[PDB]
Design a protein around this ligand. Structure first.
Ligand SMILES: Nc1nc2c(ncn2[C@@H]2O[C@H](COP(=O)(O)O)[C@@H](O)[C@H]2O)c(=O)[nH]1
Ligand SMILES: Nc1nc2c(ncn2[C@@H]2O[C@H](COP(=O)(O)O)[C@@H](O)[C@H]2O)c(=O)[nH]1
Lengths: 114, 117
């Protein structure tokens, strides 16, 4: 059940890719929600965070280490930012290939609508 | 940087109720829960901010997520769904300078950002 994210990874549909290595691809979100909104995803199809196992841990860590790098080069590192992963209906997960959202460029919070 | 109370939680130097701990990570309930499940997963090493992460941390960072997934399932929220959030510095609203992943769930969580601008 490949999603559009695998075609993005493979440069078979256009996207603004900001970083890629053998574990991870990062690209700008097509419907951004903050001045910076970048997605960082594993190059392998893992549909939900429920599907992760210990073998994925390096790629999972790289997603965070890559978001940090990207936060710096976006000029958002000092003022700050948020990283978010959504899972299933309560999380609002829309694409079934795991993704960390990097959000920033302005004060962001609260974590959840009250 | 100096240690936060989380260090004393991890080291069991302070009274606590740890939900999970291994070589790499520790998890415990937030003191001010923002959802029916609100559990923090943190590395056992002081990393003040996400800006302080390096390659050598990638295994512990990955463990934070595989552990979040394990806890979400133990909590009965894995199928319904959940959010993992990490906050950094002022714009993220980071209150404690030891990195933490928030596992939030137990209800429909609303928009990913309530202030959507
Ligand atoms: N660049 C790009 N972004 C997408 C595409 N499809 C979805 N997105 C973005 O990625 C997010 C999907 O992550 P999820 O909703 O699964 O957490 C959505 O917020 C959406 O804005 C796409 O085909 N191209
Ligand atoms: N159990 C517990 N939770 C705390 C303590 N101090 C802060 N917290 C929770 O952990 C979060 C700190 O993470 P941050 O705000 O840095 O993302 C806060 O939202 C707060 O609710 C504490 O001493 N004990």
């Amino acid at each position: 059940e490949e999603t559009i994210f695998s075609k993005i990874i493979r440069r078979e549909i256009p996207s603004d890719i900001v970083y890629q290595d053998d574990l991870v691809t990062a690209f700008r979100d097509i419907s951004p929600q903050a001045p910076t909104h970048i997605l960082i995803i594993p190059n392998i199809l893992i549909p939900t965070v429920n599907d992760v196992s210990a073998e994925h841990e390096q790629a999972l860590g790289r997603m965070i280490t890559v978001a940090a790098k990207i936060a710096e080069q976006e000029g958002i590192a000092e003022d700050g930012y948020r990283l978010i992963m959504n899972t299933n209906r309560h999380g609002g997960q829309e694409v079934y290939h795991i993704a960390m959202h990097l959000l920033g460029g302005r004060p962001l919070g609260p974590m959840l609508a009250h």
